[PDB]
Amino acid sequence: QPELTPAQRTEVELLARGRADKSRVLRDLKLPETPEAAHALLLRLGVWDEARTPYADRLRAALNAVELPVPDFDPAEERLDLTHLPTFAIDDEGNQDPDDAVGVEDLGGGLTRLWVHVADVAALVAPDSPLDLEARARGATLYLPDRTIGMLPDELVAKAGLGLHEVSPALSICLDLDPDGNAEAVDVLLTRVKVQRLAYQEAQARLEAGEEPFVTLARLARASRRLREGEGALSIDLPEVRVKADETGASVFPLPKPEMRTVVQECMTLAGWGTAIFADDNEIPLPFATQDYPTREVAGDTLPAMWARRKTLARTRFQPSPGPHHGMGLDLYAQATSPMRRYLDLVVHQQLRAFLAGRDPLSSKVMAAHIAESQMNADATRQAERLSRRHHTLRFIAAQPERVWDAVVVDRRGAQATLLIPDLAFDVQVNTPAAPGTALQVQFADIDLPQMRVRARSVLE
Numbered sequence: 090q091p092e093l094t095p096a097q098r099t100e101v102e103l104l105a106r107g108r109a110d111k112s113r114v115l116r117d118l119k120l121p122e123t124p125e126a127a128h129a130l131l132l133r134l135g136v137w138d139e140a141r142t143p144y145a146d147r148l149r150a151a152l153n154a155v156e157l158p159v160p161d162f163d164p165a166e167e168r169l170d171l172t173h174l175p176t177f178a179i180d181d182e183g184n185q186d187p188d189d190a191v192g193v194e195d196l197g198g199g200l201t202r203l204w205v206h207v208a209d210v211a212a213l214v215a216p217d218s219p220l221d222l223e224a225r226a227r228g229a230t231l232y233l234p235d236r237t238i239g240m241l242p243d244e245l246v247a248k249a250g251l252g253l254h255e256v257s258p259a260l261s262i263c264l265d266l267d268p269d270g271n272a273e274a275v276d277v278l279l280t281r282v283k284v285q286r287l288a289y290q291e292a293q294a295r296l297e298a299g300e301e302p303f304v305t306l307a308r309l310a311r312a313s314r315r316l317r318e319g320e321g322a323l324s325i326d327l328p329e330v331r332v333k334a335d336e337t338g339a340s341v342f343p344l345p346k347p348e349m350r351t352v353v354q355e356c357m358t359l360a361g362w363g364t365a366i367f368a369d370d371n372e373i374p375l376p377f378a379t380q381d382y383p384t385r386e387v388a389g390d391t392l393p394a395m396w397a398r399r400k401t402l403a404r405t406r407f408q409p410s411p412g413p414h415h416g417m418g419l420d421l422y423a424q425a426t427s428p429m430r431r432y433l434d435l436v437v438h439q440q441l442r443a444f445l446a447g448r449d450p451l452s453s454k455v456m457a458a459h460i461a462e463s464q465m466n467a468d469a470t471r472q473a474e475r476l477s478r479r480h481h482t483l484r485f486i487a488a489q490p491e492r493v494w495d496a497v498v499v500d501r502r503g504a505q506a507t508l509l510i511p512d513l514a515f516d517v518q519v520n521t522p523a524a525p526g527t528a529l530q531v532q533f534a535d536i537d538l539p540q541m542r543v544r545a546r547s548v549l550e
């Protein structure tokens with residue numbers, strides 16, 4: 090009802106975005122002078138539609154694309170030509186810029202060479218360059234349901250993304266694995282590959298037809314997982330979704346888990362393990378990913394078991410020297426496969442490329458420093474992303490009031506049960522004595538976007 094003037098609307102907007110901490114307008118209307126209260130008012134007045142999310146702004150996450158000049162790859166740099174091998178960037182349906190690709194080579198005698206090719210980002214982003222500094226200031230690419238704000242310029246992604254061009258330069262990790270999964274050798278080198286893009290479901294279809302390299306990649310991944318599990322490795326693969334938002338509204342799509350998705354994941358793990366092995370052998374400091382023992386032992390792979398396990402996990406800590414990763418069953422590990430979207434991965438590439446160029450990689454001291462600096466930024470970026478995903482997920486829920494969702498009890502707190510709706514990767518508290526693992530049907534009501542809360546209930550129980 091209160092028709093605010095333009096200047097007033099903006100005043101309220103600055104508060105909703107967290108840029109201001111007060112508002113004479115809200116104060117006057119007997120409304121709380123809080124970002125959430127300003128948000129609700131803007132919705133009630135029609136100034137803002139339900140599509141708008143204030144979380145990136147509130148957390149001071151960068152919403153602007155990086156407008157710095159991007160260097161070209163050096164054509165004279167010698168690279169191992171692998172354009173003759175079938176190579177594939179296999180990703181989620183709807184993905185747009187590949188960081189990685191996989192391939193294999195039979196080496197005879199039961200030995201197989203696994204190739205994990207990664208976008209050669211460090212060839213374009215040198216330590217301390219304006220590109221490196223801005224990427225460090227962001228920590229990670231911000232993937233909102235309605236837009237993507239890269240850690241690096243769009244120009245850079247367009248030129249380094251694998252498979253975006255007929256042939257692509259890459260920084261590759263190669264591991265020679267015997268039938269049992271033991272690595273007889275690991276290498277890191279600059280390459281040139283011809284990559285074909287496929288969604289996980291499409292690679293799965295090829296695996297099912299017995300097509301190579303899918304059949305071989307699956308054999309290697311299975312043997313590798315069995316080895317890591319033998320070393321205490323345990324899973325927290327809970328249901329995932331794609332959250333999208335556009336002109337037509339919000340959408341939440343369940344992410345299928347074909348075997349090829351698991352296989353590709355294992356190839357990334359092998360690549361990170363090899364990278365760490367390589368760095369350890371050559372005394373190259375990297376942001377090694379470590380994880381100490383969990384709070385308590387939790388067995389099983391059911392939803393409730395994985396739900397509990399995730400809560401007991403020790404935090405993943407990145408340090409300049411190798412350390413065991415309990416969750417992965419590895420003695421050492423480094424994330425090296427997503428340099429376009431994660432700053433730590435880019436640092437791994439910068440360190441490896443420096444070594445390859447016969448130069449001096451950053452010392453452990455500067456490494457500990459850059460890890461600390463980037464992580465604070467990555468934390469804020471990731472939180473802005475998580476809040477934004479929940480926002481649109483609620484819009485999706487609110488658009489289908491009549492829908493009944495399938496849920497599972499994954500935890501309990503008194504008379505309260507935590508219900509996870511897999512198709513939404515969304516959980517809510519609901520009164521019910523149902524034991525963990527119990528399948529229930531739930532309906533949602535009273536969605537409040539500014540506060541992002543909803544009331545759920547077990548139906549026809």
Ligand SMILES: [Mg+2]
Nearest residue numbers: 179180188189
């Ligand atoms: Mg990928």
